[PDB]
Amino acid sequence: FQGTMYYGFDIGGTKIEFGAFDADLVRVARERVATPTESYAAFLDAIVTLVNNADAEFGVKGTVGIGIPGIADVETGKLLTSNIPAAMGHTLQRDLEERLQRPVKIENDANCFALSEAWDEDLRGEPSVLGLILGTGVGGGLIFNGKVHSGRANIAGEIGHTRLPYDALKLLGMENAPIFPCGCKNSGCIDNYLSGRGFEQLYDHYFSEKLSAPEIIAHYEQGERRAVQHVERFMELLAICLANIFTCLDPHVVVLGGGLSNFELIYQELPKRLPAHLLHVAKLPKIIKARHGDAGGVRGAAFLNL
Amino acid sequence: TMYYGFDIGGTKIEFGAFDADLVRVARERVATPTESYAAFLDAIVTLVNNADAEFGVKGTVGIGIPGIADVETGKLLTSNIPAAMGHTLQRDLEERLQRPVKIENDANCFALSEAWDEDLRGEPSVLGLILGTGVGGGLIFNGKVHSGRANIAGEIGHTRLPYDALKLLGMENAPIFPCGCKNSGCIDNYLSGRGFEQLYDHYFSEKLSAPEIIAHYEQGERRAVQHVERFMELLAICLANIFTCLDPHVVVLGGGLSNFELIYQELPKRLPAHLLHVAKLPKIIKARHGDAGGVRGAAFLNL
Ligand SMILES: CC(=O)N[C@@H]1[C@@H](O)[C@H](O)[C@@H](COP(=O)(O)O)O[C@H]1O
Ligand SMILES: CC(=O)N[C@@H]1[C@@H](O)[C@H](O)[C@@H](COP(=O)(O)O)O[C@H]1O
Ligand SMILES: [Cl-]
Ligand SMILES: [K+]
Ligand SMILES: [K+]
Ligand SMILES: [Zn+2]
Ligand SMILES: [Zn+2]
Ligand SMILES: [Zn+2]
Ligand SMILES: [Zn+2]
Numbered sequence: 001f002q003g004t005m006y007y008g009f010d011i012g013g014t015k016i017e018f019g020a021f022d023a024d025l026v027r028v029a030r031e032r033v034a035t036p037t038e039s040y041a042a043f044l045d046a047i048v049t050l051v052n053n054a055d056a057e058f059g060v061k062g063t064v065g066i067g068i069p070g071i072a073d074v075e076t077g078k079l080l081t082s083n084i085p086a087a088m089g090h091t092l093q094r095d096l097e098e099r100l101q102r103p104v105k106i107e108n109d110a111n112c113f114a115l116s117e118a119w120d121e122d123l124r125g126e127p128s129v130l131g132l133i134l135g136t137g138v139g140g141g142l143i144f145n146g147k148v149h150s151g152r153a154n155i156a157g158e159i160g161h162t163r164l165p166y167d168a169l170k171l172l173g174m175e176n177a178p179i180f181p182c183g184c185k186n187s188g189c190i191d192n193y194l195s196g197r198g199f200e201q202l203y204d205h206y207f208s209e210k211l212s213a214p215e216i217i218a219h220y221e222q223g224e225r226r227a228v229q230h231v232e233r234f235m236e237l238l239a240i241c242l243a244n245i246f247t248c249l250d251p252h253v254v255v256l257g258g259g260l261s262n263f264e265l266i267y268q269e270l271p272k273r274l275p276a277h278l279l280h281v282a283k284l285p286k287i288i289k290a291r292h293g294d295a296g297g298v299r300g301a302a303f304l305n306l
Numbered sequence: 307t308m309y310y311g312f313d314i315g316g317t318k319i320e321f322g323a324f325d326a327d328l329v330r331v332a333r334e335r336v337a338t339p340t341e342s343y344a345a346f347l348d349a350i351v352t353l354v355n356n357a358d359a360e361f362g363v364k365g366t367v368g369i370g371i372p373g374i375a376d377v378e379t380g381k382l383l384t385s386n387i388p389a390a391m392g393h394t395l396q397r398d399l400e401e402r403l404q405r406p407v408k409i410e411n412d413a414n415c416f417a418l419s420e421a422w423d424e425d426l427r428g429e430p431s432v433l434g435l436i437l438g439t440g441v442g443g444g445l446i447f448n449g450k451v452h453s454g455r456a457n458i459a460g461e462i463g464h465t466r467l468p469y470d471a472l473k474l475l476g477m478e479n480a481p482i483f484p485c486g487c488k489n490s491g492c493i494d495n496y497l498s499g500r501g502f503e504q505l506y507d508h509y510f511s512e513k514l515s516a517p518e519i520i521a522h523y524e525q526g527e528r529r530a531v532q533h534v535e536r537f538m539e540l541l542a543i544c545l546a547n548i549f550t551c552l553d554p555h556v557v558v559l560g561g562g563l564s565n566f567e568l569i570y571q572e573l574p575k576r577l578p579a580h581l582l583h584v585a586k587l588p589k590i591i592k593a594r595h596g597d598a599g600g601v602r603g604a605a606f607l608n609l
Contacts, residue, residue: 071582071584072584073584074584074586075586076584078584080582080583080584127452128452128454128455128459140551142552144447144448144450144452145447145448145450147447147448149430149431149447149553150430150553151431151552151553151554151555152431152553152554152555152585152586152587152588153553153584153585153586154553154584155549155550155553155581155582155584155585156431156551156552156553157551157553158550158551158553158582159550159551161550161582162468162547162550162551163468163469163470163471163547164468164469165465165466165467165468165469165491166466166467166468166469166472166482166490166491167466167489167491168466169469169472174477174478175477175478179469184582184583185583186470186580187469188468188469188470244465244466245551246458247458247461247462247464247465248443248459248460248461248462248465248548248551248552249454249459249551249552250453250454250455250456250457250458250459250460250461251454251455252454252455277489279374279383279458279461279464279487280383280487280488281374281375281376281377281381281383281456281457281458282456282458283377283378283455283456285455
C-alpha cells in the first residue's frame with residue numbers, strides 16, 4: 001500500500017499545476033492541465049480530473065490542498081479572484097468537497113508560496129518572511145515566527161489591492177499617470193502595475209505597442225531605447241512601491257515568485273534603488289528569488305494537509 | 307522590584323512605576339524638552355532619580371520613543387523630535403543611570419500592552435495605531451510584537467499617501483506636506499493630530515488646533531464640518547489600504563486624536579467602500595488603558 005499521498009494544486013489564470021507528495025514529502029507526481037476560464041463546471045472538471053487520475057495511478061485517495069489567486073470568504077467560502085472573473089463568487093471548497101467526496105483545504109496562492117518557501121531550513125528560523133508573487137497579479141504571503149498570518153478575513157498580504165503611493169504616481173507623471181482599472185473594481189491598485197501583466201500594460205501605455213514581458217526584456221537586453229526607458233521606469237516604480245510596503249512590514253527576508261521574478265535585473269537594481277525611498281535607519285531585507293522555482297504554490301497547498 | 311516605564315511624547319514625557327504585582331504606584335508627567343538634547347536627556351534622568359529616591363530602590367528602565375533606534379548603531383530617528391535625532395539614547399542613559407535600559411518604539415509598546423488585555427488574549431493579530439504628533443503602528447501576531455528587520459515594523463506614518471487619498475485631496479492640487487523623515491507626502495503629516503490641523507489650515511487659512519476644529523465641528527460650523535468629512539474619508543481610505551495589506555483582527559487606536567469619538571462611528575461606515583468585497587471589518591476599539599498603554603508596554607519590556 002502506497003500510504004498517505006498529499007495533493008497540492010496551484011491554480012493560475014492559464015494552467016493548473018498539480019503535485020502529489022508521498023509520505024516522505026517526495027514529489028511523485030507533476031501535472032499541468034489547461035485552466036478552463038470559460039465554464040466553472042469545467043474549471044471544477046479540470047481539478048477533479050487531476051485528483052481522480054492521480055487516485056487511480058497510485059491507488060489511493062489523496063488529501064487535497066488548493067492554492068488560488070484570490071480569497072475564499074471567511075464566512076461564506078465564496079471566492080474573490082480578481083484576475084479570474086470565471087471563478088468569482090463560487091463556493092469552491094464545498095463544490096470540490098461534493099465532487100471529490102472528501103475534505104478540501106483552500107488557501108491563497110501567495111500564502112502557500114510563502115509558507116513553503118519559509119519552511120525551508122534557511123528561513124524557518126527567520127522572525128519574518130514576506131513571499132511576493134509578481135505574476136498575472138501581485139500577491140503576498142506573510143510569515144511571522146514561522147506561522148502564516150492569514151488575517152481577519154484571509155486578506156493578509158493582499159498588497160496587490162493597495163493603491164499606488166504618491167511617490168510612484170509622481171514618477172509616472174502625477175495627473176498624467178496611467179490609472180489602470182482593477183479586477184477588484186477599484187482603480188490604481190498596484191496589481192495592475194508590478195505584475196508581469198502590469199509591466200506589459202505600462203509599456204503599451206507609454207509606447208503604443210502590445211509587446212509581451214519576455215519580448216520587452218529581450219529588447220532591453222539589446223539596449224533598445226524604448227525598452228531601456230521602460231525598464232528604468234519599472235525598476236524605480238518597483239523600488240518605490242516595495243519601499244512603502246517595507247516601511248509598513250519591515251520583513252527580514254523577501255522571496256519573489258511568479259513569472260516576473262525570473263527577471264534577474266530585479267535582484268541587482270532593488271538594493272541600489274530602495275535606500276532612497278526607505279527611512280534613514282532602515283536596513284535592507286535579504287531579497288531572494290524563489291528557492292522552489294515555480295513549485296512553491298503547489299508544495300504549500302499540498303502541505304496545508306500536513 | 308520596581309519597573310519603570312517611560313512613554314516619550316511629541317508634547318510630554320509620561321512616567322510610570324509598577325510594583326512587583328504590576329500595580330501602578332507612580333505617575334509623573336513632564337513636558338518633553340525638545341529644544342536641547344541635554345534637556346531631553348535631563349528630564350528622563352530626573353524622573354528616574356526622583357522615583358528612585360521616593361521608593362528607595364533602583365528600578366528597571368523601559369522606554370517607548372516616538373521613533374526608531376537604529377538596529378546597528380543605536381542612534382535615534384525621531385521624525386517629530388529633531389532634538390533627539392542621531393543620539394545613542396540607550397547607551398547615553400545607561401551611562402547617566404548606571405543600569406541597563408530597554409528602548410522600543412512607542413506604538414509597539416502601546417500595542418503590546420493593549421494586546422495583552424484579557425479581552426484580546428487569543429486574537430491572532432492586533433494592530434495598535436497612534437494618531438498623535440505623528441502616526442505610528444505596533445504589530446502584534448499571536449501575542450508577540452513584530453519589530454521588523456530594522457525596528458521599522460509598523461512605521462505606517464512613513465508610507466506615502468495612496469492614489470485614492472490623493473484623488474480625494476485634489477490630485478495635482480493636493481497639499482504635499484514635507485516629513486520629518488525628509489520624504490514628502492508621508493501619511494504621518496496627514497492623519498496625526500498635527501496632520502488634521504495642517505489639512506485644516508491648508509484648506510481654510512486659519513491655524514486652529516485640533517480640539518478647536520473639533521469643537522467647531524460639534525457646533526455644526528461650515529468649515530469644520532467640511533474638514534471633518536474630508537478627514538474621515540481620508541482616514542478611511544488610508545486605513546483601508548493598510549488593512550488590505552495587514553488584515554488585522556483588532557485595531558486599537560491611541561494618541562490625542564483617538565479621543566475624537568466620531569472616528570469609531572465613521573470608520574466602520576466608510577471603510578467597506580475601499581476594502582475588498584470579501585473583507586470583514588476588524589474590531590476597531592479605543593485604547594483600553596487610556597493614555598497609559600505606552601508607559602505600561604515600556605515598563606513591561608523588563609518583565
Ligand atoms: C483579491 C485578489 O484577487 N488578489 C490576487 C491575489 O490574491 C493573488 O495572490 C495575486 C497573485 O496571483 P497570480 O498567481 O499572479 O494570478 O493576484 C491578486 O490579484
Ligand atoms: C520615523 C519616525 O520618527 N516615526 C514615528 C513613529 O515611530 C511613532 O510611533 C509615531 C507616533 O509618535 P507620537 O506619539 O505621535 O509622537 O510618529 C512617527 O512619526
Ligand atoms: Cl504627541
Ligand atoms: K495573501
Ligand atoms: K512601530
Ligand atoms: Zn484591486
Ligand atoms: Zn520584438
Ligand atoms: Zn516620513
Ligand atoms: Zn474657535
